[PDB]
Write a protein that binds this DNA or RNA. Structure first.
Ligand SMILES: [Mg+2]
Ligand SMILES: [Mg+2]
Ligand SMILES: [Mg+2]
Ligand SMILES: [Mg+2]
Ligand SMILES: [Mg+2]
Ligand SMILES: [Mg+2]
Ligand SMILES: [Mg+2]
Ligand SMILES: [Mg+2]
Ligand SMILES: [Mg+2]
Ligand SMILES: [Mg+2]
Ligand SMILES: [Mg+2]
Ligand SMILES: [Mg+2]
Ligand SMILES: [Mg+2]
Ligand SMILES: [Mg+2]
Ligand SMILES: [Mg+2]
Ligand SMILES: [Mg+2]
Ligand SMILES: [Mg+2]
Ligand SMILES: [Mg+2]
Ligand SMILES: [Mg+2]
Ligand SMILES: [Mg+2]
Ligand SMILES: [Mg+2]
Ligand SMILES: [Mg+2]
Ligand SMILES: [Mg+2]
Ligand SMILES: [Mg+2]
Ligand SMILES: [Mg+2]
Ligand SMILES: [Mg+2]
Ligand SMILES: [Mg+2]
Ligand SMILES: [Mg+2]
Ligand SMILES: [Mg+2]
Ligand SMILES: [Mg+2]
Ligand SMILES: [Mg+2]
Ligand SMILES: [Mg+2]
Ligand SMILES: [Mg+2]
Ligand SMILES: [Mg+2]
Ligand SMILES: [Mg+2]
Ligand SMILES: [Mg+2]
Ligand SMILES: [Mg+2]
Ligand SMILES: [Mg+2]
Ligand SMILES: [Mg+2]
Ligand SMILES: [Mg+2]
Ligand SMILES: [Mg+2]
Ligand SMILES: [Mg+2]
Ligand SMILES: [Mg+2]
Ligand SMILES: [Mg+2]
Ligand SMILES: [Mg+2]
Ligand SMILES: [Mg+2]
Ligand SMILES: [Mg+2]
Ligand SMILES: [Mg+2]
Ligand SMILES: [Mg+2]
Ligand SMILES: [Mg+2]
Ligand SMILES: [Mg+2]
Ligand SMILES: [Mg+2]
Ligand SMILES: [Mg+2]
Ligand SMILES: [Mg+2]
Ligand SMILES: [Mg+2]
Ligand SMILES: [Mg+2]
Ligand SMILES: [Mg+2]
Ligand SMILES: [Mg+2]
Ligand SMILES: [Mg+2]
Ligand SMILES: [Mg+2]
Ligand SMILES: [Mg+2]
Ligand SMILES: [Mg+2]
Ligand SMILES: [Mg+2]
Ligand SMILES: [Mg+2]
Ligand SMILES: [Mg+2]
Ligand SMILES: [Mg+2]
Ligand SMILES: [Mg+2]
Ligand SMILES: [Mg+2]
Ligand SMILES: [Mg+2]
Ligand SMILES: [Mg+2]
Ligand SMILES: [Mg+2]
Ligand SMILES: [Mg+2]
Ligand SMILES: [Mg+2]
Ligand SMILES: [Mg+2]
Ligand SMILES: [Mg+2]
Ligand SMILES: [Mg+2]
Ligand SMILES: [Mg+2]
Ligand SMILES: [Mg+2]
Ligand SMILES: [Mg+2]
Ligand SMILES: [Mg+2]
Ligand SMILES: [Mg+2]
Ligand SMILES: [Mg+2]
Ligand SMILES: [Mg+2]
Ligand SMILES: [Mg+2]
Ligand SMILES: [Mg+2]
Ligand SMILES: [Mg+2]
Ligand SMILES: [Mg+2]
Ligand SMILES: [Mg+2]
Ligand SMILES: [Mg+2]
Ligand SMILES: [Mg+2]
Ligand SMILES: [Mg+2]
Ligand SMILES: [Mg+2]
Ligand SMILES: [Mg+2]
Ligand SMILES: [Mg+2]
Ligand SMILES: [Mg+2]
Ligand SMILES: [Mg+2]
Ligand SMILES: [Mg+2]
Ligand SMILES: [Mg+2]
Ligand SMILES: [Mg+2]
Ligand SMILES: [Mg+2]
Ligand SMILES: [Mg+2]
Ligand SMILES: [Mg+2]
Ligand SMILES: [Mg+2]
Ligand SMILES: [Mg+2]
Ligand SMILES: [Mg+2]
Ligand SMILES: [Zn+2]
Lengths: 59, 112, 116, 140, 150, 101
RNA sequence: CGUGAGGGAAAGGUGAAAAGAACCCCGGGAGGGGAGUGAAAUAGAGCCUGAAACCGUGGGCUUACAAGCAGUCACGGCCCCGCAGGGGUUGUGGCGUGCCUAUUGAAGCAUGAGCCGGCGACUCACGGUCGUGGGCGAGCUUAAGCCGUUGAGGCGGAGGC
RNA sequence: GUGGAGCCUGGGAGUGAGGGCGCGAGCGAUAACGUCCGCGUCCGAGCGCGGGAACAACCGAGACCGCCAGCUAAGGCCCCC
RNA sequence: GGAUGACCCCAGGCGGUAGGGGAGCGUUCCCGAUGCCGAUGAAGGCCGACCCGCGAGGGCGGCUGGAGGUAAGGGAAGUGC
């Protein structure tokens, strides 16, 4: 090995063209059927505590 | 009207935290509320503060009502950077820049 | 007394840069990369003016030819008729005629046809 | 007084039969109908020629020992990947090709001389499914 | 104030060759061809200085704006006096005055005024003449000036 | 109804009522001139061999001026050589009254 | 920083006046939003002015069959300013081998340069030799000093050519 | 033969690595984008421009600026052109 | 030409590295200044598709700025990246 290294500074064009994917992609939420708050699905509702429509987590 | 909150000199990297903001720049107040809450970034907390707070101001200081609110614009400019010295092999010291961010959330009301 | 730099520099740089808006990358943003692009532009200009004369000629003559085809002779004779006869209408004009004055052109073809 | 540049034009279709036609000498003509150089309001930078339809391409004529002694070529980028097809074999598998190639190398290169070659619709066989444009038969 | 010391070794550092930081090409270091204190004075030929003094007055007269005076009436070292003398003299100071006499009294009232340049007579000089608009000399002043051009 | 005129080594087609600024002519503003005809067409159709001998076109000198600066500049490389020249061509804008003929 | 002798930094400016922002609201705070001071608060203490590189938000043109020292010339489209005129952008075509340096010869696969800003290299004295603008002319000229003035010039013939 | 000819006297230089080409010779092998002289030329400094596919020196030709005018040079006139 | 570079007519020259000669632009400072511009806005900064100059430039206008700047003509240099 002989320490490989960038040959030219990368332009803003390429630099930013690379990041063309870093696009963050929002969480996925659904209505708790009970508190109707938004929360991620298949989790136990952090706000009311119910899941499959029963008390599970003493909030 | 337009309501504005601005947190400046915040010790997170701009480039990392823009990515929380682009996820709201647009949304309702309520949508931005529920995004920045399940978004899994550090930026989540920081930006959900500014937001939350600009929606004070709108109500309290600017006679606006919540459920007309939406994140009209929201950008992040780059604050001056804590320069730090991290030591490498054979005694070279390289410089870390613990970078810094000026977060901005700007609210408006949506008629509809 | 000290005649320090002070303002001159910022002002030629501000100059050459403004001469160079529109350019790609630092060809529009860096002074010395703008300055360098502008050396280019310069001679591409001076050349291309001298080029554009001959450029158009080529355009016209190609039309002119295309016209003389439509009346059964080549450009290169049609311009010997026009010659030896006596007509001295240049080809910006012949090209103009032949496009938007077909009959008026046809005349000349004919007098050239003849002058042979 | 400024040169005349055309406004928008109309696509004039044109029909040619090859047969007994010396391939090269034909394509010359195909190319300049294709470009447009046969009409006074010509302009180098715009698509404004005719819409050449050639039929009976399979019965084109070529001179000399060329049916064999002249060769098409096709690098593929892999090693040894140079294919070599000779004229005869070409005419016998896809003859509509022989003429296309003949022309493409007389059209200019770049997005136009390509956009032009898009218009030359060639066929080996007499009939051509371009009836709904009424190709104005031409004598080459 | 710097040390004569080579700041890193000649070859192999990777940086450019340097001597010591005293060098002009470093911020800090001495300036190159600096101003150093000197003497702009020179010995203009004696004749040329005379003809200067001749010509200068000679011009002021030739314009009418010269004026020889015998002595100064109501003026014993007290501005407003001179001021009022000058009034009867034909100069209200809408033009500048070069004023010559060995007479501390006269040129003392005659100091402080904008339009007045004071002089003693042995100190007549050609800048001061041209410098002003109107020369109002005086008679012994005139003979010292005449004792000069000889 | 139109003509083709040689004026300062350069032939323009000229209908009457046209603005045609051309290579600066010596003519105090307001005066009028005549430009040889080389060809007349539409309605009639004469052809000058080389001139029409007869007619001509008359037009008024609306005034003079200098053309929008072209910036001519030469550069040669590795030889330390540049040149800036400013250029404004003198012209004389005309008003085509009518043709003769 | 060096055991030491020794080396040796960076870093000035709110405003006229602290009148340095009570109190209120989001905030754990930092910060900010009203409010309040000021001529001015994008003079708010990270404080005059506030360039350029560099990072961002918004807008107009443009871009996913295209081959490039990134420009230039020409034509057309859309956008703005306008009322045969401009400005912006770029679709197509034509043309086109970066700057500097060093060399017989470099786009050169020969040197240097990430980019910006700011420092950065033909001088001074005495002496020569030409030229030059002036002064005097078989002559021209003072040096050190003495006197005078404190931005006044005079004297001094030793001496020099 | 009035020419950015020449001669005279002074001021300031730079240059004292040249290269290709044609021709005449030495050296080399009737080799070298080889070497060394001579006579010319061009590049150097005309990597400005047309030709030669491209390309310092081969052919055409010595670029003060502008023109959407004209004749030509070499070289070209079947399409790219 | 005419009359002492006023400006017109005519003919001609005007590629250029080392290098020589010329004519100019701008920066700091000095005399011009006890003056003159300037809070009805100095210098500086940011625009401009306008004006003058071949050009280096210099004008003019808008925003910014918030206390300086400085002419005609001359002088002197820590004078242009
Ligand atoms: Mg290993
Ligand atoms: Mg980008
Ligand atoms: Mg609220
Ligand atoms: Mg260690
Ligand atoms: Mg780094
Ligand atoms: Mg100073
Ligand atoms: Mg300097
Ligand atoms: Mg800009
Ligand atoms: Mg562009
Ligand atoms: Mg050219
Ligand atoms: Mg030509
Ligand atoms: Mg002719
Ligand atoms: Mg055969
Ligand atoms: Mg010391
Ligand atoms: Mg020390
Ligand atoms: Mg020392
Ligand atoms: Mg030592
Ligand atoms: Mg080193
Ligand atoms: Mg290195
Ligand atoms: Mg040394
Ligand atoms: Mg230092
Ligand atoms: Mg110092
Ligand atoms: Mg001296
Ligand atoms: Mg006084
Ligand atoms: Mg005083
Ligand atoms: Mg005075
Ligand atoms: Mg013109
Ligand atoms: Mg130009
Ligand atoms: Mg080059
Ligand atoms: Mg060279
Ligand atoms: Mg150069
Ligand atoms: Mg010039
Ligand atoms: Mg220690
Ligand atoms: Mg210690
Ligand atoms: Mg204080
Ligand atoms: Mg706590
Ligand atoms: Mg607070
Ligand atoms: Mg806030
Ligand atoms: Mg506050
Ligand atoms: Mg401001
Ligand atoms: Mg301020
Ligand atoms: Mg700061
Ligand atoms: Mg201040
Ligand atoms: Mg500030
Ligand atoms: Mg700032
Ligand atoms: Mg954007
Ligand atoms: Mg599109
Ligand atoms: Mg394709
Ligand atoms: Mg497409
Ligand atoms: Mg190619
Ligand atoms: Mg355009
Ligand atoms: Mg193009
Ligand atoms: Mg072209
Ligand atoms: Mg290219
Ligand atoms: Mg270069
Ligand atoms: Mg350069
Ligand atoms: Mg070297
Ligand atoms: Mg070499
Ligand atoms: Mg070498
Ligand atoms: Mg050389
Ligand atoms: Mg390279
Ligand atoms: Mg070397
Ligand atoms: Mg290199
Ligand atoms: Mg170098
Ligand atoms: Mg580095
Ligand atoms: Mg710099
Ligand atoms: Mg010297
Ligand atoms: Mg000195
Ligand atoms: Mg001397
Ligand atoms: Mg005598
Ligand atoms: Mg004497
Ligand atoms: Mg000569
Ligand atoms: Mg000579
Ligand atoms: Mg000689
Ligand atoms: Mg010299
Ligand atoms: Mg030698
Ligand atoms: Mg030799
Ligand atoms: Mg030799
Ligand atoms: Mg020679
Ligand atoms: Mg030779
Ligand atoms: Mg050789
Ligand atoms: Mg040989
Ligand atoms: Mg030989
Ligand atoms: Mg050259
Ligand atoms: Mg030569
Ligand atoms: Mg050549
Ligand atoms: Mg080359
Ligand atoms: Mg060539
Ligand atoms: Mg060529
Ligand atoms: Mg011809
Ligand atoms: Mg020939
Ligand atoms: Mg001339
Ligand atoms: Mg010439
Ligand atoms: Mg020259
Ligand atoms: Mg100053
Ligand atoms: Mg003063
Ligand atoms: Mg003052
Ligand atoms: Mg006033
Ligand atoms: Mg005020
Ligand atoms: Mg203002
Ligand atoms: Mg200003
Ligand atoms: Mg003051
Ligand atoms: Mg001043
Ligand atoms: Mg001056
Ligand atoms: Mg210096
Ligand atoms: Zn719930």
């Amino acid at each position: 090995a002989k320490h490989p290294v960038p040959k030219k500074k990368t332009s803003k064009a390429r630099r930013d063209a690379r990041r063309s994917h870093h696009a963050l992609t929002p969480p996925t939420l659904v209505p708790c059927p009970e508190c109707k708050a938004m929360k991620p699905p298949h989790t136990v509702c952090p706000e009311c505590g119910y899941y499959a429509g029963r008390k599970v987590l003493e909030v | 009207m337009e309501a504005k909150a601005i947190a400046r000199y915040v010790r997170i990297s701009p480039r990392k935290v823009r990515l929380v903001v682009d996820l709201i720049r647009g949304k309702s107040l309520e949508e931005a509320r529920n995004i920045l809450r399940y978004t899994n970034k550090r930026g989540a907390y920081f930006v959900a503060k500014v937001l939350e707070s600009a929606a004070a101001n709108a109500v309290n200081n600017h006679d606006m009502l919540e459920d007309r609110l939406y994140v009209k614009a929201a950008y992040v400019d780059e604050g001056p950077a804590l320069k730090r010295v991290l030591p490498r092999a054979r005694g070279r010291a390289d410089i870390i820049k613990k970078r810094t961010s000026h977060i901005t959330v700007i609210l408006g009301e949506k008629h509809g | 007394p000290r005649a320090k730099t002070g303002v001159v520099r910022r002002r030629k740089h501000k100059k050459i840069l403004k001469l160079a808006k529109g350019y790609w990358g630092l060809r529009s943003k860096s002074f010395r990369k703008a300055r360098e692009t502008l050396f280019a532009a310069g001679n591409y200009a001076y050349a291309h003016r001298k080029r554009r004369k001959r450029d158009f000629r080529r355009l016209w003559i190609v039309r002119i030819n295309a016209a003389c085809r439509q009346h059964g002779l080549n450009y290169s004779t049609f311009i010997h008729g026009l010659k030896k006869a006596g007509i001295e209408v240049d080809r910006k004009n012949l090209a103009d005629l032949a496009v938007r004055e077909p009959q008026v052109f046809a005349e000349l073809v004919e007098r050239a046809k003849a002058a042979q | 007084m400024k040169t005349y540049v055309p406004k928008q034009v109309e696509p004039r279709w044109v029909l040619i039969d090859a047969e007994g036609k010396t391939l090269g000498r034909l394509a010359t003509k195909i190319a300049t109908l294709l470009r447009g150089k046969h009409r006074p309001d010509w302009t180098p930078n715009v698509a404004m020629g005719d819409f050449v339809v050639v039929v009976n391409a399979d019965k084109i004529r070529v001179t000399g020992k060329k049916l064999e002694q002249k060769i098409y070529t096709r690098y593929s980028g892999y090693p040894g990947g140079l294919k070599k097809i000779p004229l005869e074999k070409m005419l016998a598998t896809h003859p509509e090709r022989v003429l296309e190639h003949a022309v493409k190398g007389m059209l200019p290169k770049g997005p136009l001389g390509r956009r032009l070659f898009k218009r030359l619709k060639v066929y080996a066989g007499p009939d051509h499914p371009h009836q709904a444009q009424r190709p104005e038969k031409l004598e080459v | 104030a710097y040390s004569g010391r080579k700041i890193w070794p000649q070859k192999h550092t990777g940086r450019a060759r340097h001597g010591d930081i005293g060098a002009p090409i470093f911020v800090g270091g001495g300036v190159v061809f600096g101003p150093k204190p000197r003497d702009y004075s020179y010995t203009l030929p004696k004749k040329v200085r005379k003809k200067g003094l001749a010509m200068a007055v000679a011009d002021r007269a030739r314009e009418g704006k010269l004026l020889l005076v015998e002595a100064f009436a109501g003026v014993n070292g007290k501005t407003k006096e001179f001021l009022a003398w000058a009034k009867e003299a034909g100069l209200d100071g809408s033009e500048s005055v070069l004023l010559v006499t060995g007479n501390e009294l006269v040129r003392r009232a005659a100091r402080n005024l904008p339009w007045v340049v004071t002089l003693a007579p042995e100190g007549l000089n050609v800048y001061d003449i041209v410098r002003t608009e109107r020369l109002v000399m005086d008679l012994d002043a005139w003979e010292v000036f005449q004792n000069r051009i000889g | 109804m139109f003509a083709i005129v040689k004026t300062g080594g350069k032939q323009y087609r000229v209908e009457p009522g046209l603005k045609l600024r051309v290579e600066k002519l010596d003519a105090e503003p307001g005066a009028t001139v005549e430009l040889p005809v080389l060809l007349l067409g539409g309605e009639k159709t004469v052809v000058g061999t080389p001139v029409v001998e007869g007619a001509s076109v008359v037009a008024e000198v609306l005034g003079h001026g200098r053309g929008k600066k072209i910036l001519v500049s030469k550069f040669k490389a590795k030889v330390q050589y540049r040149r800036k020249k400013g250029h404004r061509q003198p012209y004389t804008e005309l008003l085509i009254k009518e043709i003769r003929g």
